[PDB]
């Protein structure tokens, strides 16, 4: 064949690229699910139940999403965008309500996604949802750090406490 007549980028594909870039740069939770062909009423009901938690959904064509993803650092998501796709976009990720609202529908499975640049599967999302909060784990960090000295002091103070316990046992026996 003759040499390639190279194609030009159009305004629509430029807008799509800019939108995908803004999505992947701004928000934190980017979940990838299989867009199930459901009725429009149920789709709007799910829209409302997601807007209650303030997590939105987007849909991008594969012809514009595959090249962007294979060019960016998210090339590990290529086998996820083969069929129908749905990008759940959320700021300040809270996967608990998302898993709860997807449990109510049996044939709508969570494929995967990234939570703060951490690509996880469905089991990874389940583990992240069951995991405690950031404030709670930060409060537990210092506790687990000082637990060594706490157990040290406990062992140092339990020696006089053993006599007290034996004395209380002898009192209770009589």
């Amino acid at each position: 064949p003759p040499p390639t007549p190279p194609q030009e980028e159009t305004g629509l594909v430029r807008l799509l690229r800019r939108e995908i870039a803004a999505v992947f740069r701004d928000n934190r939770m980017i979940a990838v699910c299989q867009h199930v062909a459901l009725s429009a009423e149920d789709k709007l009901l799910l829209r409302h139940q997601l807007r209650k938690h303030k997590i939105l959904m987007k849909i991008f064509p594969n012809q514009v999403l595959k090249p962007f993803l294979e060019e960016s650092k998210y090339q590990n998501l290529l086998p996820l965008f083969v069929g129908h796709n749905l990008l759940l976009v959320s700021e300040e990720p809270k996967v608990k309500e998302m898993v709860r609202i997807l449990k109510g529908i049996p044939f709508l499975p969570l494929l995967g996604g990234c939570i703060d640049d951490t690509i996880l599967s469905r089991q990874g999302f389940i583990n992240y949802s069951k995991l405690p909060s950031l404030a709670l784990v930060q409060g537990e960090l210092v506790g687990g750090l000082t637990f060594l000295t706490a157990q040290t002091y406990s062992m140092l103070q339990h020696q006089p406490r053993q006599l007290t316990a034996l004395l209380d046992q002898y009192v209770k026996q009589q």
Partner: protein, 45 residues
């Protein structure tokens, strides 16, 4: 640059090396340094 290798829990055995090197940095310090770090953490957070 690139992102992580997309791990899962079915065969989870590789942990971030930053955690291990931070644990080593903690364990390679004396008790007074650990007390200073704990005091600074309790004051800030």
């Amino acid at each position: 640059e690139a992102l992580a290798g997309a791990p899962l829990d079915n065969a989870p055995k590789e942990y971030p090396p930053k955690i291990q090197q931070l644990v080593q940095d903690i364990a390679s310090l004396t008790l007074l340094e650990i007390s200073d770090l704990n005091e600074l953490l309790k004051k800030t957070l």
